[PDB]
Design a protein around this ligand. Sequence first.
Ligand SMILES: CC(C)(C)NC(=O)[C@@H]1C[C@@H]2CCCC[C@@H]2CN1C[C@@H](O)[C@H](Cc1ccccc1)NC(=O)[C@H](CC(N)=O)NC(=O)c1ccc2ccccc2n1
Length: 198
Amino acid sequence: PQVTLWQRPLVTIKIGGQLKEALLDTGADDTVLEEMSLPGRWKPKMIVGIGGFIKVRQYDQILIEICGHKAIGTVLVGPTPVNIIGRNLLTQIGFTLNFPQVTLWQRPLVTIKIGGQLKEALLDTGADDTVLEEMSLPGRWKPKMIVGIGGFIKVRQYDQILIEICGHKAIGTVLVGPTPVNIIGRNLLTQIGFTLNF
Ligand SMILES: CC(C)(C)NC(=O)[C@@H]1C[C@@H]2CCCC[C@@H]2CN1C[C@@H](O)[C@H](Cc1ccccc1)NC(=O)[C@H](CC(N)=O)NC(=O)c1ccc2ccccc2n1
């Protein structure tokens, strides 16, 4: 039941009698889905992430069947370009992040070394790119723009940047911006042999 990050980690979920594809996002606390038909009463919670914010309707004790494994918990519903399975449900259906093994009961944080500085970063199977907080980074970049849930943010795209994550090396592309969390995305994650399990 191993899954690599070379491609986006998508799974089939049965929720509300219907079928959707979703992303397994070790970088999200919460599970959020596109605008779909779910019965019951909800809570007007607001969710936050890069690019800004978005409002969603909170449901509790909703049943969801991910890759044919049942789980019950809080699903959230609002405008998301992607269906996302966050950590609340991953923990339950038993998902582990291996590379020895990181559980999702807490946020998967590692300490990385980049540009001679030490930082704490989030292991995010839900991100295709690696985005770091604003820091001093020598070299040359190009002015790429990127998007999350609450909108979009401008960031500097340095390439060939070297990083030591939890005691392994990887050279690759890093982005630097106004993000509140350091994100280790799937591009560097693939180079250090992280995988998902059941
Ligand atoms: C990094 C980048 C390349 C931009 N990709 C992404 O950001 C993609 C974009 C995708 C398409 C749109 C829908 C979201 C998905 C998943 N995201 C990654 C995805 O992993 C994103 C990573 C992240 C973490 C923390 C803060 C910001 C952003 N997580 C999230 O958006 C989830 C939403 C949720 N769980 O309710 N955010 C959080 O879990 C979360 C946790 C702590 C926080 C503290 C302060 C402020 C915000 C905080 N947000």
